[PDB]
Every structure is written in C-alpha cells, then in structure tokens.
Scaffold this motif. Structure first.
Motif, PDB file in Angstrom:
ATOM      1  N   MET A   1       0.822  -1.208   0.000  1.00  0.00           N
ATOM      2  CA  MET A   1       0.000   0.000   0.000  1.00  0.00           C
ATOM      3  C   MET A   1       0.863   1.267   0.000  1.00  0.00           C
ATOM      4  SD  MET A   1      -3.073  -0.879  -0.341  1.00  0.00           S
ATOM      5  CE  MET A   1      -3.079  -2.388   0.630  1.00  0.00           C
ATOM      6  N   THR A   2       0.900   1.956  -1.138  1.00  0.00           N
ATOM      7  CA  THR A   2       1.780   3.113  -1.299  1.00  0.00           C
ATOM      8  C   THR A   2       1.061   4.388  -0.896  1.00  0.00           C
ATOM      9  OG1 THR A   2       1.239   3.858  -3.531  1.00  0.00           O
ATOM     10  CG2 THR A   2       2.598   1.908  -3.345  1.00  0.00           C
ATOM     11  N   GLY A   3       1.800   5.369  -0.395  1.00  0.00           N
ATOM     12  CA  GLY A   3       1.166   6.590   0.060  1.00  0.00           C
ATOM     13  C   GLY A   3       2.052   7.820   0.172  1.00  0.00           C
ATOM     14  N   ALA A   4       1.513   8.963  -0.237  1.00  0.00           N
ATOM     15  CA  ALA A   4       2.260  10.216  -0.167  1.00  0.00           C
ATOM     16  C   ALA A   4       1.527  11.261   0.663  1.00  0.00           C
ATOM     17  CB  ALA A   4       2.525  10.746  -1.566  1.00  0.00           C
ATOM     18  N   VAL A   5       2.280  12.021   1.452  1.00  0.00           N
ATOM     19  CA  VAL A   5       1.763  13.168   2.176  1.00  0.00           C
ATOM     20  C   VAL A   5       2.164  14.462   1.454  1.00  0.00           C
ATOM     21  CG1 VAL A   5       1.807  14.453   4.326  1.00  0.00           C
ATOM     22  CG2 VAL A   5       1.884  11.925   4.348  1.00  0.00           C
ATOM     23  N   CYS A   6       1.196  15.341   1.213  1.00  0.00           N
ATOM     24  CA  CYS A   6       1.446  16.662   0.645  1.00  0.00           C
ATOM     25  C   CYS A   6       1.256  17.730   1.720  1.00  0.00           C
ATOM     26  CB  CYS A   6       0.512  16.917  -0.540  1.00  0.00           C
ATOM     27  SG  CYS A   6       0.707  15.765  -1.902  1.00  0.00           S
ATOM     28  N   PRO A   7       2.354  18.166   2.338  1.00  0.00           N
ATOM     29  CA  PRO A   7       2.298  19.072   3.480  1.00  0.00           C
ATOM     30  C   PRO A   7       2.375  20.536   3.059  1.00  0.00           C
ATOM     31  CG  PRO A   7       4.525  18.382   3.189  1.00  0.00           C
ATOM     32  CD  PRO A   7       3.746  17.794   2.024  1.00  0.00           C
ATOM     33  N   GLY A   8       1.854  21.430   3.889  1.00  0.00           N
ATOM     34  CA  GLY A   8       1.869  22.849   3.567  1.00  0.00           C
ATOM     35  C   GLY A   8       0.926  23.602   4.471  1.00  0.00           C
TER      36      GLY A   8
ATOM     37  N   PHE B   1       0.213   7.343  -6.309  1.00  0.00           N
ATOM     38  CA  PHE B   1       0.244   6.669  -5.021  1.00  0.00           C
ATOM     39  C   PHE B   1      -1.156   6.156  -4.700  1.00  0.00           C
ATOM     40  CE2 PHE B   1       4.533   7.754  -3.563  1.00  0.00           C
ATOM     41  CZ  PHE B   1       4.850   8.834  -4.392  1.00  0.00           C
ATOM     42  N   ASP B   2      -1.249   5.098  -3.901  1.00  0.00           N
ATOM     43  CA  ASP B   2      -2.558   4.526  -3.590  1.00  0.00           C
ATOM     44  C   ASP B   2      -3.393   5.523  -2.788  1.00  0.00           C
ATOM     45  OD1 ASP B   2      -2.136   1.922  -4.850  1.00  0.00           O
ATOM     46  OD2 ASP B   2      -0.813   1.445  -3.167  1.00  0.00           O
ATOM     47  N   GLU B   3      -2.763   6.164  -1.819  1.00  0.00           N
ATOM     48  CA  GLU B   3      -3.417   7.153  -0.980  1.00  0.00           C
ATOM     49  C   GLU B   3      -2.630   8.484  -0.897  1.00  0.00           C
ATOM     50  OE1 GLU B   3      -3.614   6.072   3.069  1.00  0.00           O
ATOM     51  OE2 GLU B   3      -5.240   7.498   3.582  1.00  0.00           O
ATOM     52  N   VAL B   4      -3.347   9.602  -0.851  1.00  0.00           N
ATOM     53  CA  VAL B   4      -2.714  10.897  -0.627  1.00  0.00           C
ATOM     54  C   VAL B   4      -3.335  11.549   0.604  1.00  0.00           C
ATOM     55  CG1 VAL B   4      -2.248  13.186  -1.585  1.00  0.00           C
ATOM     56  CG2 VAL B   4      -2.144  11.160  -3.067  1.00  0.00           C
ATOM     57  N   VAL B   5      -2.490  12.055   1.484  1.00  0.00           N
ATOM     58  CA  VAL B   5      -2.955  12.858   2.595  1.00  0.00           C
ATOM     59  C   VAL B   5      -2.412  14.261   2.469  1.00  0.00           C
ATOM     60  CG1 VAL B   5      -3.042  13.182   5.065  1.00  0.00           C
ATOM     61  CG2 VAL B   5      -3.081  10.866   4.084  1.00  0.00           C
ATOM     62  N   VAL B   6      -3.311  15.231   2.407  1.00  0.00           N
ATOM     63  CA  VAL B   6      -2.924  16.628   2.459  1.00  0.00           C
ATOM     64  C   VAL B   6      -2.826  16.999   3.921  1.00  0.00           C
ATOM     65  CG1 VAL B   6      -3.524  18.989   1.732  1.00  0.00           C
ATOM     66  CG2 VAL B   6      -4.042  17.041   0.231  1.00  0.00           C
ATOM     67  N   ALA B   7      -1.632  17.391   4.353  1.00  0.00           N
ATOM     68  CA  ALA B   7      -1.416  17.762   5.742  1.00  0.00           C
ATOM     69  C   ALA B   7      -1.338  19.278   5.866  1.00  0.00           C
ATOM     70  CB  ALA B   7      -0.153  17.103   6.294  1.00  0.00           C
TER      71      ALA B   7
ATOM     72  N   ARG C   1      -7.142  12.423   1.055  1.00  0.00           N
ATOM     73  CA  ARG C   1      -7.703  12.768   2.351  1.00  0.00           C
ATOM     74  C   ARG C   1      -7.050  14.035   2.894  1.00  0.00           C
ATOM     75  NH1 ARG C   1      -5.530   9.061   5.577  1.00  0.00           N
ATOM     76  NH2 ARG C   1      -4.647  10.025   7.467  1.00  0.00           N
ATOM     77  N   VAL C   2      -7.831  14.895   3.533  1.00  0.00           N
ATOM     78  CA  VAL C   2      -7.277  16.115   4.090  1.00  0.00           C
ATOM     79  C   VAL C   2      -7.238  15.991   5.601  1.00  0.00           C
ATOM     80  CG1 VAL C   2      -7.363  18.625   4.071  1.00  0.00           C
ATOM     81  CG2 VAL C   2      -8.352  17.326   2.162  1.00  0.00           C
ATOM     82  N   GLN C   3      -6.134  16.414   6.210  1.00  0.00           N
ATOM     83  CA  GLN C   3      -5.941  16.283   7.648  1.00  0.00           C
ATOM     84  C   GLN C   3      -5.041  17.381   8.198  1.00  0.00           C
ATOM     85  OE1 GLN C   3      -3.955  12.979  10.756  1.00  0.00           O
ATOM     86  NE2 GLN C   3      -5.307  12.390   9.062  1.00  0.00           N
ATOM     87  N   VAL C   4      -5.413  17.951   9.338  1.00  0.00           N
ATOM     88  CA  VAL C   4      -4.549  18.901  10.033  1.00  0.00           C
ATOM     89  C   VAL C   4      -3.320  18.169  10.560  1.00  0.00           C
ATOM     90  CG1 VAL C   4      -4.373  20.598  11.877  1.00  0.00           C
ATOM     91  CG2 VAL C   4      -6.505  20.310  10.636  1.00  0.00           C
TER      92      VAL C   4
ATOM     93  N   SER D   1       3.456   8.106  11.215  1.00  0.00           N
ATOM     94  CA  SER D   1       2.332   7.742  12.085  1.00  0.00           C
ATOM     95  C   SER D   1       1.155   7.219  11.278  1.00  0.00           C
ATOM     96  CB  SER D   1       1.889   8.937  12.933  1.00  0.00           C
ATOM     97  OG  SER D   1       2.809   9.167  13.991  1.00  0.00           O
ATOM     98  N   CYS D   2       0.939   7.829  10.124  1.00  0.00           N
ATOM     99  CA  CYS D   2      -0.176   7.468   9.276  1.00  0.00           C
ATOM    100  C   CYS D   2       0.228   6.396   8.268  1.00  0.00           C
ATOM    101  CB  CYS D   2      -0.698   8.720   8.583  1.00  0.00           C
ATOM    102  SG  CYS D   2      -1.113  10.026   9.790  1.00  0.00           S
ATOM    103  N   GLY D   3       1.388   5.790   8.497  1.00  0.00           N
ATOM    104  CA  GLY D   3       1.877   4.696   7.679  1.00  0.00           C
ATOM    105  C   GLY D   3       2.145   5.030   6.228  1.00  0.00           C
TER     106      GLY D   3
END
Ligand SMILES: Cc1c(C(=O)O)cnn1-c1ccccc1
Ligand SMILES: Cc1c(C(=O)O)cnn1-c1ccccc1
Ligand SMILES: Cc1c(C(=O)O)cnn1-c1ccccc1
Ligand SMILES: Cc1c(C(=O)O)cnn1-c1ccccc1
Ligand SMILES: Cc1c(C(=O)O)cnn1-c1ccccc1
Ligand SMILES: Cc1c(C(=O)O)cnn1-c1ccccc1
Lengths: 146, 146, 146, 146, 146, 146
Positions: free
Chosen positions: E1-8, E28-34, E60-63, E74-76
């Motif tokens: 399960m691949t995943g990228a975080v886009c922080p800003g 990527f399988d999952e994206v989290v906007v941080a 997904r969007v997350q603080v 933490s979010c793997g």
C-alpha cells in the motif's frame, strides 16, 4: 510615446539604482521613478531621487500606492524596468493580471554588491559606502548618523 | 528613434522567440531580428522568422555577422533584447566593449520549457511540438522529416 | 603570520561549523572564531565553541561587535573564512570598505543540510539531530528542552 | 609552511586570474600556478603568467599533469585556491580522494564578466578586451591576430 | 500500500497545489494533504482543500502538528510529495532523522508564478488572481475582502 | 499497478544511481531502469546495473531507444524518477508531449558529488573512486584500466 516605470522603496536610492534610471532614460521616451510606500521618510526619499537625477530631463519622480501595474497603466506608461527568480515570479504575475511587461537590466559590475539595506547596515556601523551612493544620499546619511 | 535588436541563431524560431519579438515591438520604435551565423540553412531561418512576424509592422529580419554589438551600433539601434548568468556575462561584456545595453524579459510561462535544440531533438524522435512553434516552422519541420 | 576569522552567531555551533574551523586551522597560523551578537546566550555559545574546539590549539574564540571587517583588521588577522550569493554580496562589500578578503569552503557532504536554525526547530519538535552537532551542544540541548 | 595551488588552463591568463593570484599570495606562504594541459601553447601560457606576476615574489608558475590533487600533495602544498556548483562537485571529489581542500574567492566586481574563452572570442571578432587582460597577454594577443 | 503526504500551510490552497495533489493521487494509492499549523483559519483551509479535491477519491485532508516526518510515519504513509535548495535542506534533514523520502514535481508552467502569499497580496490590492485559484478559494476570497 | 522508469546512460552506474533505484523501488510497485543509447558498451552497462540491483526484486533493467516518454507509456509505467533546471525543462517538455510526470529525489549527501563522467575522469587519472561505485563497477573499472 514609449515609457518605463522604475519602482522600488529607494530607502535610500543607490548608484546602482541611478545607473538603471540612466539606462531606462536612454531607451524610453519617459521614465517614472515610483517610490512605493524604513529609514528615510517619503519626502526625503523623493528629494534624494530628484537631487540624484537632475541630469535626466525625461525622468519624473512620483510616490506610488497599490499595485505597481495599476501605477504603470494609470500613467499610460508601457513597461516596468528594474535592475538585476523572485523578480521572475512578480514579472509573470504582473503580466498575468495587467498585461504589463518587465524588462530587466544587469547591474553595472561596480554596483553589483550594493543594496539599500546593506548600505544602511554598513553605514550605521561606521563603514564608508559613500562611493556607492549619490552625494545627496551621502549628505543626508552623514547628517542622520551625526 | 528607439530600437532593439533581438539576436539569435533561430534554428528554428520558436513561439517563445516570437513572444519576445512581440513584446520588444510593443516597446521600441523599431525591432531588428538578427540571425547570427545547424538544421535549417540561413535562408530557411529568415523565411521562418518573416513568415512568423508579418503581424509586426515595425520588425525587420536581417542576417548578422560578427559581434552583436557591432550590429547594434551599425544599424543605429539602441539596445539588445532577449528572453530569459551566462547572458549576464555577455551583457556585461557587451556593455564594456561597446556601451550597448541588454534588456531581459521573462518567457511567457507556457513557453518556459521550449528551446530550439530541445524542439529539434523531440521532433526528430517523433514527438509533437507543434504547439510550441509557429505554423511556418511546423510546416517546414514536417517536410524535412518526411 | 597568517590568520583567518570565522564569524557567525553560532546559536548553536554545528559539526558543519567545526569542520570549517578545522579546515581553516589547517591552513592559517591562527584562527579566531568571532561570535557576533536567539536560543543560547553569549556565554553558552562561547562555551560550546570552546568545548568543541579543544583539539585545535591555534584556534581562539572571541565575542565580536560591529563590522566583521573591523574585527578582522583590529586583531591583525588577514582574511574571513566561512563555509558554503548573499555571501557574495557581503564578501564584495567587505572587500570594498576594508580590503578584507573572504575565502569560502564547501561543506563536507554529510553536513550539507545542517544549519543552526534547522537543527533548533527539529530538536524542539522532538527530532534527533545529535549526529549533526558537537556533544557539548547535544548535552546543553537536552538540558534546555528537559 | 602554508601553500596554495591555483590551477587552470590559463589560455590566456586574465586580470581576474591575476587578482586571485594576488589574493592567494597575500594569505599563503607560497603560491603555485599550475597550468593544466586551445589558442596559446604551453610555453606562451607560462610566459604570460610569469610576465604578469613578477610583482608576486612568493608565486611560482609550473606546468601540471594529471589530477590537480596529485600536484598539490606532491609539491607539499596544502590547498587549492580558485576564483568564483561545478566547482563544488570537484572540490568535494578532490576532498574525497586526496583530502585536499579548496578555498574559493569572489571575483573583483570589475572582472566578474571576463573569462579566457569570452575574451578570446571577443578579441578575434575585433573587440577591445585589453582592459581585462594583462599587458603581456594584450601584447601577444595583438601579434597573433595581426 | 503506497502513500504520499502533501504538506503545507495552504493559506490558501492554489491551483498549483491542486495540480500537485492530482499528480500525487495518480501515482500513489493514498494521498494525505497535511495542513500544517495567516489569513484563513484552520477550518477554512480544510474546507477549501476538500472543496477543491472532491474529484480525487483517494485523497484525504488532515490537520498536522509537529514534524512532518512524524505525520508521515504515524499514518503509515511512505513519502512526502511537493511541488517545485531550501526544500533540498529539509528533504535531506527529513531523510536523516526519520528515513522519510521526498519526491519533488515541477509546477505546471501556467502555475509557475502563483504562490499563496503572492496571490493574497495581489488579491488584497485589487488584482484578479481567480484564474490561479480554485473556485472555492475564489468564493471565500471575494467574501473576505467584501 | 504503479510504476516508475529510471532513465539514464549509466556509463557507469554509480552508488548515487543505486540509491535512487532503491528509493523508487520502495515507493512504486515496479521499477524499470532504462539504459538509453561512451566508455562501457551496452551489454556491460546492463550487467553492471543488474549486478548492482539484485537486492531489488521489483526492479527490471532494459535498454531504451527513442523518447523516454514513449518508453514509459509503452511499458505501461506511470512516471519517470530521477535523482537531483535542465531537468526542469525536460520534465515539462515530457509532460507536454506525453502527459508523463517526473518525480525528482535529492541525492544522499554522501553521493552528492559523484557523477559517471567525473568518476571516469578521476579513475582514468589514477584516483580512487571505489567508495562511490558498486563493486560490480569497481571490478570492471579495474580491469579496463589494467
Ligand atoms: C537592487 C538594489 C537595491 C535595493 O534593492 O536595495 C539598491 N541598489 N540596487 C541596485 C540596483 C541596480 C544595480 C545595482 C544595485
Ligand atoms: C531561448 C529560446 C530558444 C533557444 O535558445 O533555442 C528557443 N526558444 N527560446 C525562448 C525564448 C523566449 C522565451 C521562451 C523560449
Ligand atoms: C552555515 C551553517 C549553519 C548556520 O548558518 O546556522 C550551521 N551550520 N552551518 C554549516 C557550516 C559549514 C558547513 C555545513 C553547515
Ligand atoms: C574563471 C576565469 C577565467 C576562465 O575560466 O577562463 C578567466 N578569468 N577568470 C576569472 C577568475 C577570477 C575572477 C574573475 C575572472
Ligand atoms: C508552492 C506554492 C504555493 C505557496 O507556497 O504558497 C502556492 N502555490 N504553490 C505551487 C505549488 C505547485 C506548483 C505551483 C505553485
Ligand atoms: C546524476 C548522476 C550521475 C551522472 O549523471 O553521471 C552519476 N551518479 N549520479 C547521481 C544520481 C543520484 C544521486 C547522486 C548521483
């Protein structure tokens, strides 16, 4: 009727700036120096630019407020000129929102290292930067530290 | 009478180049495109520039030989204009030896990545760069690979 | 008698800094670390530099005030040394006003990404930067967050 | 006994180069100019450097072959000095394989735009670069084009 | 399960940002906007990102709070993705302390000059940047200046 | 099914390259190293990459011809990955003509200064670069100079 605006805070104007003013004045029918609203107040800044540009008959000095591109288009001028990637960002933003173009010109080598901020910091700590600034600026600089 | 020279090898001219030509033409009384002596021969290069600039009445295309600053001063023009540190070196060298100034203008974003060399290599290997080149270039490009 | 000054705020000193100190010490008869007046107070900064440089017999640590070039010339030193365009501006300004030269040396690759500011921010948010800082700094860093 | 090697092809040596030689000579006990094996032959290059550096008693000119770091270490010198990212790559490679350090110094502003290659091209096409080169180079340059 | 975080800080999110989100989501399988804790408050920022990314089902969007690498691990998730030397420093610091990798992707040319800060300053002074921002941002931007 | 192509001439492959391969392999389902058609012949280059990547089960090595984006799309891969403005030009050209994205990753600090060309030149002149290259390359390098 061709025209360039040379925008900046000019706090204070440097010989690098005057070199750019001179080269813009040589290529455009009219030049407007836009002093965009620090060490010197607005009035001082204007005076210093005027005193340093008397040899440029087609140059005018004017305080500016708001977007530089509003200033350009309102005064019917046709271009922004400034001396040299941050500028790149602004130039393209300025082309996007107002269609105003920006022409960059390379600093004369002897003024490559002079900036208003650096001149101020060096002057305040006792260094001699008078060879990098117009005599009208030097005069006022001496008086403000004395 | 104000005037800018836009120098280059233009092998071939790109839409990035034409954008620069357009912006120079908007600010100076006269523009001369100087084709400085590769894939296309001199005649083709000239034609392609002319065919791509018919909408610019104050622009003239001319082959150049020798120093660009000799070209500028001989034709009574007043400045070099080109689209954008190597250029910095040349601009200052050109100011040193002939007093000729160079005004740089930022590429339109959509043409930021197009160069004559890269267009050629991509075209030759089968890629579609027709959106980055004038139709007169596209026409000749198709014919030279077919 | 040859001599280099290594100026900075050293808040705190990093292994990148010590590497530069070491290389300056290897080439000049004397090295002075000038701590130019933040997280650590002046005394702490001095201590940390001294504790980290005991293996450099020809290095001296000293607080500095005012222009770095005044510091250089007053202490009869002959050059500024620092680890690596903003520096370019300052080096040329420093040559202009005081005739002082600046020699730049490239960071060791393993310390290329460490800065005092970045180390501090990462340390404060719980990251382990102890491999990038001298043990005297690590010791004090642990104690200030605990 | 401290010592710096100033390596290069020096085809021809420029006033920018001589400025670097001068500043190295001021900081190190001995300077060796290493002419690393074009327009001028080896003998001419040597002569031109020697003729341009008579005012530097602790400077020696020598032809170099192979890795610059072999040259440095063989002659017991302690550092490479040169005037200013490609250099960054080489400096770190040179530190990796031989432990030799490289100190960079900023060009004097007035020589910021002069390079051997650019001087040659401009000279050959009839431009006056004599203010950027030592008189021994100017002399030989005139004779080779005449 | 691949995943990228886009922080800003996304204050506000721009079309440049959304382009990066889109390209990360494609690879990527999952994206989290941080959204890392200014003009808009946290809630507004989240909303604006969510409203602008409904077409990205795997995003997904997350603080976020603290080190971005803590957030990633933490979010793997497996990587940081962001749009484009300061970043270089952070990417290497982030690899050092947490083993987290950073993949950079070039801005689409048409968004090369848009930044949250520049958009804000231009919007506040009356310039039209609506072509550079998502309609959910434009909507809120109009309302906050009206 | 996610996939990245790592293109290059790999003449020879370096530890910098392998680091990039490793990081791509960690993030994408499949990696293809595309050896794009010098010191080593094609067969040697392939072997060296294969011998250096046995620990990467999802990596495949393949000779490439023509546009890299044709290679990417033909093999159903989804992205180009490479280690780090010229690349910027190519990445945007590659997005323009084929919709293929390019993800850049920063070199590990310890490999920041190694390139195939520089390694070759240093190896040929007798320098030890074996710490910067895979043992399969070192082996073949020794044999080709002996
Ligand atoms: C940018 C600048 C400043 C400033 O921004 O403070 C002060 N002088 N100059 C300058 C302008 C043109 C050439 C050289 C120097
Ligand atoms: C420099 C250049 C070339 C070239 O040098 O080959 C081809 N186009 N352009 C260009 C010019 C202005 C703006 C964008 C691109
Ligand atoms: C510039 C710097 C700082 C700083 O400015 O905070 C902290 N370390 N270093 C450093 C110095 C030399 C080499 C590597 C890193
Ligand atoms: C690099 C260089 C060359 C060259 O590489 O050809 C010729 N002069 N200079 C130079 C050196 C120091 C300062 C200014 C210029
Ligand atoms: C970096 C950035 C900002 C910002 O940092 O404020 C706002 N947009 N973008 C952007 C991102 C990717 C591409 C183009 C632009
Ligand atoms: C670009 C490059 C080359 C090359 O282009 O020759 C050889 N190694 N590397 C490299 C790749 C990633 C990180 C460090 C170095």
């Amino acid at each position: 009727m061709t025209g360039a605006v040379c925008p900046g805070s000019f706090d204070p104007v440097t010989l690098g700036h005057v070199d750019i003013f001179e080269r813009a004045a040589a290529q455009f029918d009219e030049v407007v120096v836009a002093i965009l609203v620090g060490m010197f107040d607005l009035d001082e800044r204007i005076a210093m630019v005027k005193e340093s540009t008397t040899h440029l008959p087609n140059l005018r000095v004017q305080v500016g407020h708001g977007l530089v591109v509003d200033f350009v288009r309102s005064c019917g001028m046709t271009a922004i000129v400034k001396g040299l990637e941050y500028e790149l960002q602004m130039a393209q933003m300025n082309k996007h929102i107002a269609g105003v173009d920006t022409f960059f010109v390379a600093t004369a080598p002897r003024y490559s290292f002079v900036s208003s901020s650096l001149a101020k910091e060096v002057a305040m700590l006792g260094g001699d930067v008078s060879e990098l600034l117009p005599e009208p600026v030097n005069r006022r600089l001496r008086d403000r530290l004395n």
